[PDB]
């Protein structure tokens with residue numbers, strides 16, 4: 001009491017107990033959710049797995065500090081399956097400068113390989129009940145009778161910190177009756193629990209991975225996507241680390257299984273390897289491309305997986321995964337120290353000591369540092385590096401050793417990796433500004449507003465300010481509407497938006513700036529529109545007379561400034577240094593007839609949640625690269641199309657919805673790739689968008705898209721006023737607001753006419769003629785609003 005077969009939850013800790021003579025054993029305390037010990041395991045006919053592993057944490061040395069690494073005592077040499085040993089291939093991608101197609105090559109090194117593993121085949125056979133719920137595992141594996149493996153030192157050493165892991169699973173259970181636990185200890189100190197500061201953690205699931213990954217292991221829905229590997233049984237980092245060691249490899253490809261090398265390459269979209277049952281897992285998507293383009297008979301659609309990982313931050317954004325704020329692992333700084341496979345996993349993509357065998361020999365009369373060392377020291381170039389434009393050899397020759405080789409508490413290559421992110425923070429603080437409310441004299445066509453700038457050197461006088469965009473958008477109090485595309489006007493070519501570069505006051509005849517210390521008052525004139533049936537520029541700005549103003553300031557920063565006590569900002573016309581751009585947003589101010597506030601548009605998503613995956617203050621100019629991207633936002637087509645820059649900053653306050661709303665202007669897309677913000681964002685992240693503008697690859701969303709709480713906070717989906725918004729008029733017809741929201745996943749076309757009829761029965765319109773919907777007519781909220789009978793929070797797999 002209580003019997004395993006009536007237990008609904010298991011919790012286990014193998015925190016307990018220890019070994020001698022090479023013979024290892026450990027106690028497993030198996031209990032309830034509440035903590036009633038579960039009895040009868042050792043007899044149980046419904047056990048799926050019981051696995052235990054053990055490993056020592058060996059030290060490493062070289063120039064500077066290098067972190068310790070796990071060695072499993074349990075290992076074996078695996079041979080490659082001949083028919084699943086992947087062949088080399090190539091594929092076309094893009095054109096060179098002459099306009100000729102570029103061919104890329106992907107290369108492998110199939111061959112026998114070491115793999116760390118655990119003890120899985122024993123199960124109950126190794127168990128002796130010792131107490132209520134408390135079992136005892138003695139390893140079949142003895143530390144003394146371990147078969148030698150070439151290159152690997154497997155000798156037992158009680159002075160080194162040690163790990164044992166448990167994976168335990170019953171009744172086919174993906175969560176409730178699944179456990180991974182582990183114990184680290186120091187055998188020599190009578191097997192005492194290791195201090196956090198003694199073992200090796202490096203990354204923590206919650207501090208480092210959860211910002212993007214789902215850990216809803218029990219998720220039953222069709223779109224579940226929890227981070228649980230190997231049939232669903234492996235979920236804890238501490239467990240990964242025993243098998244995914246620096247020496248393990250996939251024999252079919254030569255790919256490393258080292259945890260860092262594997263994790264960097266997966267998220268960079270370069271990793272490929274063959275796993276259980278000969279399934280090829282290609283994280284680049286290029287295998288499927290090659291198969292399509294020239295044949296590749298080892299790729300089997302519907303069994304092998306070849307899809308490009310689409311990471312929502314830069315692979316250079318280390319803080320996404322490695323803590324720098326001292327609230328993660330105590331050994332978090334491990335990422336600052338050189339380690340061949342880690343460094344190579346980004347900078348040496350696609351190279352190997354067989355196809356790049358020259359790099360095994362240093363240049364004449366230089367020291368041999370191994371394959372990776374020699375690349376970093378001698379052979380790397382900007383044209384070939386895994387991060388294009390990077391020059392490692394120049395840092396070797398010119399930047400001093402402490403650039404990569406770090407003593408404990410030094411920065412090492414982190415000085416290069418975090419430099420732009422750090423300077424970005426400082427410059428956003430230093431150039432912070434406030435927009436005051438504007439006074440719009442509509443009959444005069446004149447908007448006056450004041451910027452509270454950081455100093456008495458105004459934006460147009462500061463050569464480190466590349467551009468300083470302020471955009472104003474009409475807002476009628478219900479929802480933004482872009483409207484039809486007008487003919488061009490002096491200030492822009494949109495009915496509802498004007499963007500003006502305040503840094504170019506001296507050459508803009510419509511713009512005046514009057515400084516008063518730090519405060520600069522700007523007067524923009526020529527905002528005039530004849531109101532009738534025709535589309536004309538500023539038509540809504542003029543007829544509504546009010547709305548919002550948003551700032552997007554671009555500061556030029558010096559990419560060669562690495563010392564954080566120096567000034568990062570640099571004169572934009574400087575020619576020595578490569579320059580990168582720092583973005584500084586603002587408050588969202590109002591404009592109106594007397595400069596009083598305009599009530600804020602409702603907030604229906606969480607800024608912080610977008611930032612979990614995209615990082616803080618992500619920029620989306622590059623999302624506007626397809627069409628008229630080089631047109632400036634004060635100039636004709638660029639008013640809407642610009643990427644230089646796109647003039648929105650924040651994600652949750654409706655800045656994007658100023659354009660991405662239910663009334664796209666011209667060359668309209670159909671619903672199934674529609675322009676309206678909720679429709680677009682739902683379709684991208686749920687892979688229901690028929691076509692993405694800039695890539696043929698579907699987003700690889702690391703959460704469950706039906707987990708509404710990935711983006712929405714509790715209380716944001718009441719749906720109470722949603723039916724009062726304007727319908728979304730797509731190319732072919734219009735869709736009422738709640739319909740557009742739900743059908744973006746549920747019905748991107750009229751495939752299932754029961755769903756469509758459900759919409760039409762309850763006040764909804766779906767691909768109807770323009771003007772059919774009357775705001776107010778949808779009655780969706782009564783049943784689907786949060787907390788109702790079929791509430792969006794009850795019916796989807798949410799985790800708030």
Ligand code: HEC
Pocket residue numbers: 738739742743746755758759760762763764765778779780781782783784790
């Ligand atoms: C206003 C036009 C709407 C819209 C846009 C939706 N609903 Fe409903 N809905 C209700 C019930 C009882 C179900 C079935 C529940 C179940 O089988 O578990 C549904 C189903 C849906 C869906 C899912 C359709 C699909 O199979 O993909 C969608 C997208 C949807 N609804 C949207 C209940 C109600 C109501 C109770 C009287 C009301 C009113 C509405 N729904 C209104 C709307």
Ligand code: HEC
Pocket residue numbers: 115116117118228229230234235236237239240241242243244249250251252257273274275276281
């Ligand atoms: C030892 C029992 C393992 C533990 C614990 C974990 N993994 Fe693993 N994994 C292991 C091996 C030997 C292999 C290669 C198999 C081969 O055929 O050569 C892998 C493979 C992966 C992969 C590649 C994709 C796949 O084959 O499914 C991934 C992404 C992976 N492993 C991840 C991973 C994670 C995150 C783990 C902790 C939750 C983890 N594995 C534990 C062996 C073992």
Ligand code: HEC
Pocket residue numbers: 067201202203241259260261263264267315316317318319320321322334335336337338339342343417
């Ligand atoms: C998740 C998508 C990551 C990003 C982005 C970066 N790193 Fe990483 N890194 C990650 C993991 C899961 C690990 C393995 C930890 C382990 O159990 O081995 C690492 C490891 C490294 C290491 C090696 C650390 C060590 O073995 O002690 C280094 C040197 C490293 N990472 C550097 C690094 C840099 C510079 C990054 C930004 C440019 C970066 N990593 C990103 C996960 C992820």
Ligand code: HEC
Pocket residue numbers: 061062063064338339340341343369370372373376377392393395396397399400401402403404405
């Ligand atoms: C990054 C651009 C580096 C700079 C600058 C320097 N070194 Fe380096 N070195 C680097 C790597 C990635 C490696 C491989 C490490 C591995 O685990 O494979 C090496 C190797 C060495 C070694 C061997 C011992 C070791 O620390 O692993 C030595 C002794 C060494 N490098 C010396 C060295 C010196 C003297 C440098 C300044 C003139 C120097 N390195 C710069 C990366 C980089």
Ligand code: HEC
Pocket residue numbers: 264315316317335336337338339342343344345346347387389390391392395403404413416417419420
């Ligand atoms: C991807 C997760 C990486 C890992 C692993 C490593 N580095 Fe890296 N490196 C990466 C990026 C995205 C960049 C460019 C940074 C930028 O702001 O543009 C770099 C750059 C470097 C540099 C500077 C190169 C130059 O300025 O020309 C060095 C010296 C460097 N990287 C070294 C290095 C070492 C030694 C690593 C192992 C600890 C290592 N990198 C891992 C991305 C990634």
Ligand code: HEC
Pocket residue numbers: 211212213310311312605606609610611612613614620622623624651681684685692694699700701702703710711
């Ligand atoms: C992780 C669970 C995410 C959450 C939370 C948010 N986004 Fe996302 N998004 C994610 C991925 C993996 C991708 C694909 C990235 C790629 O390179 O293709 C995206 C994509 C976007 C895009 C499109 C970018 C492009 O095609 O140019 C947009 C505009 C976007 N995401 C916006 C966005 C918003 C506003 C979110 C909060 C409501 C948000 N995302 C959350 C991963 C995740």
Ligand code: HEC
Pocket residue numbers: 497620623624625626627628629639640641642646647648649650651655656657658659660673680691692693694
């Ligand atoms: C008008 C001034 C815009 C604002 C403000 C925002 N976007 Fe936009 N976007 C706009 C247009 C005219 C286009 C068409 C394509 C082009 O290159 O001009 C787009 C397109 C997008 C897309 C394309 C997605 C796809 O079809 O797969 C994305 C992902 C996108 N825009 C994102 C986006 C975000 C997140 C914005 C707020 C930061 C945003 N846009 C503002 C016009 C305008």
Ligand code: HEC
Pocket residue numbers: 482483484485486493494495626627628636637638639640641664665666667668669670673674675693731
């Ligand atoms: C805002 C008032 C716009 C201005 C000014 C111009 N365009 Fe545009 N365009 C706009 C939208 C919202 C869209 C997407 C419609 C959708 O439903 O997704 C477009 C589309 C195009 C296209 C099609 C390619 C595409 O990215 O979808 C083209 C070729 C195009 N726009 C050209 C174009 C030109 C030449 C303009 C100046 C004469 C111009 N656009 C202005 C919105 C707006």
Ligand code: HEC
Pocket residue numbers: 203204208209210211212213225229263266267309310311312313320321613614700701702703
């Ligand atoms: C977004 C910025 C991420 C963070 C932070 C981390 N991961 Fe990730 N991971 C991300 C994406 C977009 C993908 C592809 C889509 C998907 O979820 O399948 C992944 C994938 C993985 C995998 C492979 C899963 C599989 O198919 O076998 C692994 C093993 C993985 N990610 C691990 C992982 C770890 C350990 C992280 C913290 C150190 C982590 N990721 C952070 C996006 C993001």
Ligand code: HEC
Pocket residue numbers: 603604605652653654657677678681682685704705706707708709710711712716717719721722738741742792796
């Ligand atoms: C991030 C990738 C999202 C996930 C996951 C889900 N939604 Fe969403 N939603 C997203 C955005 C960018 C928007 C528009 C935001 C804005 O400022 O306009 C929306 C909007 C909605 C709406 C309209 C709500 C309203 O305006 O009153 C609804 C009804 C909605 N989303 C529903 C919803 C459901 C039920 C989800 C889980 C199945 C869900 N969303 C996921 C972004 C994201």
Ligand code: HEC
Pocket residue numbers: 220221222223682686705706738741742743744745746784790792795796797
């Ligand atoms: C993508 C992010 C979605 C949004 C937006 C909406 N829904 Fe959804 N919904 C989505 C998925 C992938 C699923 C399947 C979940 C599962 O457990 O397999 C669902 C489920 C439902 C259901 C269940 C009943 C049914 O007949 O399917 C209902 C009733 C439902 N969803 C309603 C609904 C409404 C009203 C939405 C707009 C407010 C809506 N969903 C948005 C994915 C997404």
Ligand SMILES: [Ca+2]
Pocket residue numbers: 250251252274275276
């Ligand atoms: Ca394999």
Ligand SMILES: [Fe+3]
Pocket residue numbers: none
């Ligand atoms: Fe035309």
Ligand SMILES: [Mg+2]
Pocket residue numbers: 505506507508509510511512
């Ligand atoms: Mg002027």
Ligand SMILES: [Mg+2]
Pocket residue numbers: 624625626627628629640641642643
């Ligand atoms: Mg564009």
